[PDB]
Amino acid sequence: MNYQPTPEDRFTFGLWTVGWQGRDPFGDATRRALDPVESVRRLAELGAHGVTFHDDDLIPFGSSDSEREEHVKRFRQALDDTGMKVPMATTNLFTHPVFKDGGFTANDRDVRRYALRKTIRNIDLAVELGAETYVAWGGREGAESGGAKDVRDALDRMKEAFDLLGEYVTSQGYDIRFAIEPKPNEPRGDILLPTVGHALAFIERLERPELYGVNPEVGHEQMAGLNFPHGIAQALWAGKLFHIDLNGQNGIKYDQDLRFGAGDLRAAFWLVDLLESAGYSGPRHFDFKPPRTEDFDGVWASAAGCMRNYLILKERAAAFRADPEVQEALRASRLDELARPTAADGLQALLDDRSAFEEFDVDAAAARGMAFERLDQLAMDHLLGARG
Amino acid sequence: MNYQPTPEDRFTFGLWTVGWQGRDPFGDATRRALDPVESVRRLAELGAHGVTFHDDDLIPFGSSDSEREEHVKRFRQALDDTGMKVPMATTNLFTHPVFKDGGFTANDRDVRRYALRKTIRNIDLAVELGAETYVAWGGREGAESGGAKDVRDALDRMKEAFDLLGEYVTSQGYDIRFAIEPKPNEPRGDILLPTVGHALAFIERLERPELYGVNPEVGHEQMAGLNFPHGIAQALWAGKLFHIDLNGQNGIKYDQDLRFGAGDLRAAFWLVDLLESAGYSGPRHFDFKPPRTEDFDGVWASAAGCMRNYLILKERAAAFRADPEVQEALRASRLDELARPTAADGLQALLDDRSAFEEFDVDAAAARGMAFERLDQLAMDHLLGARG
Amino acid sequence: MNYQPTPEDRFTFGLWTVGWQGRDPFGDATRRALDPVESVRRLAELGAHGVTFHDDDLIPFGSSDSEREEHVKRFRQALDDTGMKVPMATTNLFTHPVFKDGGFTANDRDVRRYALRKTIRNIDLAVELGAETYVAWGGREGAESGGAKDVRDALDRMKEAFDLLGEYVTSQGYDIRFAIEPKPNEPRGDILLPTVGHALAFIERLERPELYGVNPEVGHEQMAGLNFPHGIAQALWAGKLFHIDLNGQNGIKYDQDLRFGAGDLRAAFWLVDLLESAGYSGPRHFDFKPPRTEDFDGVWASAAGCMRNYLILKERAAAFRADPEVQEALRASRLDELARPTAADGLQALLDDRSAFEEFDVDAAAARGMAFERLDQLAMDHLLGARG
Amino acid sequence: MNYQPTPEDRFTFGLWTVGWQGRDPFGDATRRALDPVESVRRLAELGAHGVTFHDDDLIPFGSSDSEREEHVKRFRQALDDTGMKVPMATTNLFTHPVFKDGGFTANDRDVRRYALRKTIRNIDLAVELGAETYVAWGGREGAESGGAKDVRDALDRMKEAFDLLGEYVTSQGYDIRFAIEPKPNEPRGDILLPTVGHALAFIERLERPELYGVNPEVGHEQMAGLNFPHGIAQALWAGKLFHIDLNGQNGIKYDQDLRFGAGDLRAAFWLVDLLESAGYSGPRHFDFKPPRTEDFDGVWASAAGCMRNYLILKERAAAFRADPEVQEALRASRLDELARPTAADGLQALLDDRSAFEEFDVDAAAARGMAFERLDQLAMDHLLGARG
């Protein structure tokens, strides 16, 4: 009846999303560049809550300290005129040829130091604009060949970089946290910290782990054929879901960055169900690319579609959970038992419990059906709005 | 000239590998069952160091405490007669219908308790036989549909199970460590802790993390299209590579379990180079399946091939690293710089270093070629034994 | 409001689908065997139109000519009592160990001859029961290693087999056509004629091409990451879609055989839209497996779900095409122009047409947006029943 | 001992390969543009036989008929000075924004006509330069969404385009054949005629099928997880392998275009074995991209590596086939029987042959091992130069 977004929904977009000119590895741009100020105004009209940026999206690379000031001021004025917020910022450590072998893990030491300085500079700006999260996507960290990169040394350099950024943030007294964005490949043959799991594990080896979280992207985990909602559940379980990138992907292939809802629709439904059920309160950020076949009217239609699909799925997931028939099916499938401790009675009690082994009727238990197909069809009926 | 394995190479095989009867989802067995005693004798003849087992491989499910004693005694006699060792053992929590929805994370609480008791029983046996590592492969932990499993609750149950096993081991004063074996899918649609990264991250949330490591399998990470050597490098970096399963896999599809060397040959080369360079001293365990097209002579030929390929790759990786031309190429590609700290001088020094940003010549640095293709061709020449 | 199937919908199921006992490569069966007579009765109750079978599903392998007669008679009586039809039949050339290296392309000549005799025998039975289509799924035709199979010779043997079957059918004056079912892998490492394209190309080299078509399966093309609806469109374009296997698959991994609607939901929508738009009049056959987690109530629920999902998607696809707003969007995206000939005026006229090259305004044409995102969102809104 | 290529080896390179500037979807170019004349000279020095080009690689888009003449003349002079040949040419129907929705299958009719005129113009030039094959890679033919393209209409337009090109070639009396290059995806979400199979099937529906063949690329079939050598075997079987694109790819992900030999090494070995065994006499064309990490010395090293790897594999494949031990193993695995007709005796004789069914000992046949693992290890030993 009404799927109109309002800033309360916390939907955000990166400047580079709706601003993508359409240049791909086999073709030239199909759209002219958008001035960040226009993007803010257009996104505000659509019901967006805010925007995000890479340093290089806002301030052209090589800009003087004076041109830099002018670009920030214009942007700040657009934010003030629209009420749009800037909850997240990041660094571009992948476009310029100097980062061809990476930023934080480039083999060249001078490049690694430059990467850190470029990042620190943008952290100051991020804080100025009010960002609460600083994302790091090591797109160029990795290799196409085995001897080019000693991964153990690379991880030492990656840890060193993140520890220094942590030391900087704490010495300046900033209220900002970091979020690592994993991706398995593209543009490098293999990228370091390829999935949410690898990123979470790496974080536990940092000096101040409390300052780091993860920024998973639906399409990235799907490029490894992984179950996105499951990955998000593990991140939440560890208390590390600081931010999230929403989009669509059609299986294992190049990173498509389709609008949210496109790609794996059922996974989108399960993702929304999880985010809403867990009470995730961070931004619902869309990192997508309106296909190069579109003109500007098509880009705004695509962006609007991102928000619309999230809202439709939110309604359907809510109806699913509130349905008494579904609550009954969840009990029939023993989801209630899954939430109860296996042995709150303790180890010794379990060892002495003859009902757990000596007298356990394995055949009777094995004959119990899980009733998962009925439950899944109810989920399907809810998603399609076909409940009879 | 000589690629003959000896027990010093630490090559091991699971009883279920060479003993696989050939039953697959579309066909009946093509080979008769092997008596574990024959397998030990045959493997000892081939130069193997030891064997591994699931409880159910050694003692048929449902066996009485007396039949259990006889099976262990026969096995023990074969080990004594051959000098074969048993460095690792594991539990079968996947074959019996009772584990259709998992063991440690089954929705049914009584099944979870049974899973733990079955495991504890085999841990005692493992220690008796001298195993240093106890592997856990949660093959049935997961789902085919989204509502069937609440992943956060499932992870709570998985943690609970592993913590209890840790409490047991420490209360008995055993000298045994655990290793979690990840797998992304099959037999479940999606399996919990799908990759080495997810497993490493989970371990950091256990009560006694020092007791747990990972047991990665080449084919499993490859089923997610991940770079196995990179994953192993991260495990070593974290000091968690307790054991390893070697085999072959041809890309993203069902788990093939080809003999080691088959599948991705170059990845096999890089894996061996890494294991030997890092000084991994654990067993080189083969978890493979001789294809159902083979008779018994073909199974022993396949097992022998596993060891032969490891030894050939070991020689080639050693020649590669010792080659002065390669050492020169490694420096040309700046691998030496990758190993040097980015900023041992500290944060403040980096911030004040004008050569790192203000006066950094980005164009000059960007113009430096990495020389990675030459290095990779030298690696190729070494692998193929074609160095001119 | 009403998604109840009736025999008019032409929904069919293989005996081996609802009859799958749940045995997978890592576990024993979780359900007892179903008597084909019970399956027919249960499927008739659900609204099914008919069933299909492999010879070995109906007559246990090794059965005497007398036991064979009894099995057929019982089955025939169930068909008569329910009004169920048998539109398709096939041969099991994959379960028995003798077919470990294939049937029609086994390296052993005696096995190939046996494969043909086994097939011919079942063709006679198929005709007797009224089947119009005879499917061939060469599940064991292929290899795990490169030297094991010379593919050119294998294709010669595959052609030889199919030509002989064609000669048999025509000499007996039967009214039956063949349909080749492609699959890229599993149970073999690589299967011959891996996709719909390969199968269509092979057919054009047979002696009587008019007798052969294809029987694509949604999950099989998806195991190669291919777009199923596109593949079906090519089959229809060539006039070769004789039959179709419907199910669900979650990307590139083992063949899941989920119920139809599960897996890639959007692809299911586009498939139904295409089948209904093209006027496909053959059976809507479900080749799926109710997950081993289910008891018998779960299998019937899963089968019912197959039909329900098809009917829901059919309604949504129909609403999409009938929507004036959609018809308007289709014109805005120039689908009408795609259907008009590029050069009905002829080659010479095109060469002399200056508006086609010399005076063609490429920049103006390039600036036209395709309006594909708006069209796709309308499709999404229709699928979810969210049209405002 | 000597892997130096000479023009007799027929190795060719596209101008766009060694000339790739390194621009990818996330970064700017890392190398300056190469003048085609320099590329010809450098490639001739390396032992190459010839080069190939897209119209737009040789003549900048938008060039006047006079600038066009100058570019061709300079190129012609470089060919004369080096003795380099031009065996293949193709059209660029993917870079310019006008082709954003395709060339031959664009929804806009005026674009389709323009695509044909652009192609015809380059065919004339190709003939002038002596090309025997004209390749067509429909990189933009396809879609990202289901409603954007009616595939049946698209195939009608694709057929119409190719038929017109055939009519043109025959009316001009040219001695040139066409080769369709399939690719499953990238840059479009899904590309029409996604694999070698689909392309072969489509060709059989053209007016003059004898004029069309296929130009498969190793990395493209691998992006669908298909077995390249198997696909090539089917193309040869149909007498349609007119040309071939050689490169390397690491599984299912974006198109990497690694140098030949890199990626799947074993598949490269089996490919060379097949091409040399079948007597393929066309060019060995490399369609690869030297990684953006390299400077110009790295690009020439990468190109040289393509040829070197082919020559090493050629030697190893030859040694494998000539090895008496291997010839013996091939007979043990019954490859000789695979080449013998299944029933040269005819249908009736087969039906009356009791040894084929009634008296066939299935158990005895089933017990015969295929000896495939031994054969494969011999292949492995040969590839690695480790034959004892």
Ligand SMILES: OC[C@@H](O)[C@@H](O)[C@H](O)[C@@H](O)CO
């Ligand atoms: O694949 C590109 C990646 O998703 C990128 O867009 C990051 O999200 C961004 O650079 C960090 O915010």
Ligand SMILES: OC[C@@H](O)[C@@H](O)[C@H](O)[C@@H](O)CO
């Ligand atoms: O895919 C099967 C898995 O690899 C299994 O064989 C484990 O390795 C074993 O159960 C634990 O040791």
Ligand SMILES: OC[C@@H](O)[C@@H](O)[C@H](O)[C@@H](O)CO
């Ligand atoms: O992957 C199994 C395949 O789908 C099989 O079930 C065929 O459809 C059947 O044997 C022919 O009808």
Ligand SMILES: OC[C@@H](O)[C@@H](O)[C@H](O)[C@@H](O)CO
């Ligand atoms: O993926 C790009 C494709 O391989 C292209 O390079 C073609 O080969 C060429 O355009 C035709 O010759």
Ligand code: NI
């Ligand atoms: Ni992304």
Ligand code: NI
């Ligand atoms: Ni992405």
Ligand code: NI
């Ligand atoms: Ni992102």
Ligand code: NI
């Ligand atoms: Ni395994």
Ligand code: NI
């Ligand atoms: Ni495995």
Ligand code: NI
């Ligand atoms: Ni394993």
Ligand code: NI
């Ligand atoms: Ni199937």
Ligand code: NI
């Ligand atoms: Ni299937």
Ligand code: NI
């Ligand atoms: Ni099927």
Ligand code: NI
């Ligand atoms: Ni290509």
Ligand code: NI
């Ligand atoms: Ni390519």
Ligand code: NI
């Ligand atoms: Ni190509």
